[PDB]
Enzyme design. Structure first.
Site, PDB file in Angstrom:
ATOM      1  N   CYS A 135       3.381   1.574   9.299  1.00 33.25           N
ATOM      2  CA  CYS A 135       3.337   0.412   8.407  1.00 33.25           C
ATOM      3  C   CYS A 135       4.731   0.017   7.908  1.00 33.25           C
ATOM      4  O   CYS A 135       5.614   0.873   7.786  1.00 33.25           O
ATOM      5  CB  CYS A 135       2.341   0.610   7.272  1.00 33.25           C
ATOM      6  SG  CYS A 135       0.656   0.941   7.843  1.00 33.25           S
ATOM      7  N   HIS A 175       0.811  -1.217   0.000  1.00 33.27           N
ATOM      8  CA  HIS A 175       0.000   0.000   0.000  1.00 33.27           C
ATOM      9  C   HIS A 175       0.859   1.289   0.000  1.00 33.27           C
ATOM     10  O   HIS A 175       0.299   2.363  -0.094  1.00 33.27           O
ATOM     11  CB  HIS A 175      -1.085   0.016   1.084  1.00 33.27           C
ATOM     12  CG  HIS A 175      -0.607   0.228   2.476  1.00 33.27           C
ATOM     13  ND1 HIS A 175      -0.781  -0.749   3.441  1.00 33.27           N
ATOM     14  CD2 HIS A 175      -0.080   1.328   3.061  1.00 33.27           C
ATOM     15  CE1 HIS A 175      -0.305  -0.234   4.565  1.00 33.27           C
ATOM     16  NE2 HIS A 175       0.130   1.007   4.388  1.00 33.27           N
ATOM     17  N   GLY A 199       2.144   6.002   9.504  1.00 25.52           N
ATOM     18  CA  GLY A 199       3.572   5.960   9.215  1.00 25.52           C
ATOM     19  C   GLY A 199       4.279   4.745   9.811  1.00 25.52           C
ATOM     20  O   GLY A 199       5.434   4.475   9.468  1.00 25.52           O
TER      21      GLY A 199
HETATM   22  C1  LIG Z   1      -3.664   4.916   9.752  1.00 24.82           C
HETATM   23  C2  LIG Z   1      -2.921   3.783  10.412  1.00 24.82           C
HETATM   24  C3  LIG Z   1      -2.652   3.812  11.775  1.00 24.82           C
HETATM   25  C4  LIG Z   1      -1.969   2.764  12.359  1.00 24.82           C
HETATM   26  N1  LIG Z   1      -1.539   1.694  11.683  1.00 24.82           N
HETATM   27  C5  LIG Z   1      -1.793   1.654  10.372  1.00 24.82           C
HETATM   28  C6  LIG Z   1      -2.475   2.662   9.687  1.00 24.82           C
HETATM   29  N2  LIG Z   1      -2.730   2.569   8.299  1.00 24.82           N
HETATM   30  C7  LIG Z   1      -3.669   1.791   7.716  1.00 24.82           C
HETATM   31  O1  LIG Z   1      -4.580   1.242   8.326  1.00 24.82           O
HETATM   32  C8  LIG Z   1      -3.466   1.571   6.229  1.00 24.82           C
HETATM   33  C9  LIG Z   1      -4.483   2.102   5.249  1.00 24.82           C
HETATM   34  C10 LIG Z   1      -4.513   0.657   5.626  1.00 24.82           C
HETATM   35  C11 LIG Z   1      -3.995  -0.428   4.721  1.00 24.82           C
HETATM   36  F1  LIG Z   1      -4.517  -1.652   5.154  1.00 24.82           F
END
Ligand SMILES: Cc1ccncc1NC(=O)[C@@H]1C[C@H]1CF
Ligand SMILES: Cc1ccncc1NC(=O)[C@@H]1C[C@H]1CF
Lengths: 304, 304
Positions: A145, A41, A143
């Site tokens: 990920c 992603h 950030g």
């Molecule tokens: C915003 C956030 C906050 C913490 N960990 C991860 C994220 N990001 C997501 O969930 C990304 C968009 C999806 C893809 F599956």
């Protein structure tokens, strides 16, 4: 003595963290040998995340569009490929800090350390368990990920998790290092049902042995139980059914303490039925399920 | 989202760990520049530990008696000196892995990460607090002495603790990096009274702000209190008295959430007086005091 939620030393993993940028999106990558692994992603804009067609989005990207930076060093990308939900960026330089490593798919109920990262930089390390429903209750902000989960056996790092997303419920989801999600999750900004979770019974029992080893003994009683009777109680309290395999893995702790597994099950049964009555066990006021029997043995013996 | 007991990434500290052996005793040393720091009880036999005369015991030791090993490398000792309860072993080689570092004496109630080590090898890392009574509730077995506590500010490691001993009660005691014990403790195998401990009120309040930030809000009430009224409750429940300094450090969290510090104090007051009623806060069934206001801000913003 003492018992803590201990994480593995993160040094070998820190040496692998890099920053990956594609267009306007930045996240973390894992640099092992001449390959950088990151969530696919990274190629999406927040607009694309609602229903991404990854094959199409990746076709518009070339090697020069993936900016990979290890602190101050810029890595040259000579290949890109998507494997499930991970992107593999072939670089022209092997990471000099690559430790001995494996890619493993862990089972639910197993534990691992997470090195939370932002912009390719490590912020912190914590130990956690893969829930029976394949989610992790981590600590991840935007950030984060590309941050990875791992275990270490002497000098070998077994990478088991890469962070991809936060569900609308605030729980976390991710993949193994081949990009296969744990659980039914997809890398899309959509409501996703995590399964009914349960407490990891064998881990709670292992933690009860650690409590006895360290002096917390008040919960020990004059009773015993059977796997069948205990499982009726486990059912009522949303605990995983205990199997002979779980009893077998508890063998070393049962041997060290001299408390038979079914006798410990009877203590757990009374704790489930009566609560803690305002008392604590190893500084916790609830039944802890994030220590496996192997974690308890390792910590209790001082394995390095 | 999510909130974890996060430790600092231990990589910079791992690069400094060495093994120090003197006679039959082995423990951990910290190699920074051309000096190895270790607990002075490395010169004692278990027999000497009952009433050691360290000046006399050290006089019988020469540079060649201190065996210092960094993994497979043997370091040459060209000087030895005792400073308070630490031994400083001058070596002929500066540690190539020496990070930017400071030696700091932390205050009680402050937190730090511990890198538990055995035979100069890192076993694990955990976050903990220095108790108001100057003990730490760590996880340390025989051979763990010389393991250090630290904090990190970007690229600088502030070493604040070196492990020296386990009290008969199972709690841990140690020194700053100049060898001064935190608390009234001495490096002798004798019964030692740790002071009456208290809960770190400002840390519990900081953790209550972290709970609100992450969605756990059930404990918020329609009440407020004063520093005087709250301190009467804090007194009854063995909590540290809250000062204006503590209120001032909670400012950023009060500002971010819009919940006035005294309003959060009233929620804490009701939690102390009524308990949790079988509920949890950030996965804990008790009031957590091992997160400072700085820890909460750092974790909640993603500081690397
Ligand atoms: C915003 C956030 C906050 C913490 N960990 C991860 C994220 N990001 C997501 O969930 C990304 C968009 C999806 C893809 F599956
Ligand atoms: C046996 C042990 C276990 C865990 N941590 C530390 C220790 N060791 C000690 O207490 C050493 C003998 C004293 C010096 F103050």
């Amino acid at each position: 003595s003492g018992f803590r939620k201990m994480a593995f030393p993160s040094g070998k993993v820190e040496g692998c963290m890099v920053q990956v940028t594609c267009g306007t999106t930045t996240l973390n990558g894992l640099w092992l040998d001449d390959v950088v692994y990151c969530p696919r992603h990274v190629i999406c804009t927040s607009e694309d995340m609602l229903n991404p067609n990854y094959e199409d989005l990746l076709i518009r990207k070339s090697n020069h569009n993936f900016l990979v930076q290890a602190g101050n060093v810029q890595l040259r990308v000579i290949g890109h490929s998507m494997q499930n939900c991970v992107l593999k960026l072939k670089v022209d330089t092997a990471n000099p800090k690559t430790p001995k490593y494996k890619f493993v798919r862990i089972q639910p109920g197993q534990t691992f350390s997470v090195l939370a990262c932002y912009n390719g930089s490590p912020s912190g390390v914590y130990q956690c368990a893969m829930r029976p429903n394949f989610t992790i209750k981590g600590s991840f902000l935007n950030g984060s990920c590309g941050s990875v989960g791992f275990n270490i056996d002497y000098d070998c790092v077994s990478f088991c998790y890469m962070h991809h997303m936060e569900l609308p419920t605030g729980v976390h989801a991710g993949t193994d290092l081949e990009g296969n999600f744990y659980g039914p999750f997809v890398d899309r900004q959509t409501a996703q049902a995590a399964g009914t979770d349960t407490t990891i019974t064998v881990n709670v029992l292992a933690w009860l042995y650690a409590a006895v080893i360290n002096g917390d003994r008040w919960f020990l009683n004059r009773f015993t139980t059977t796997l069948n009777d205990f499982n009726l109680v486990a059912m009522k309290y949303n605990y995983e059914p205990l199997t002979q395999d779980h009893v077998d893995i508890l063998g070393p702790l049962s041997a060290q303490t001299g408390i038979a597994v079914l006798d410990m099950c009877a203590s757990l049964k009374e704790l489930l039925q009566n609560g803690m009555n305002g008392r604590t066990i190893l500084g916790s006021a609830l039944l802890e399920d994030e220590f496996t029997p192997f974690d308890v043995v390792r910590q209790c013996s001082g394995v390095t």
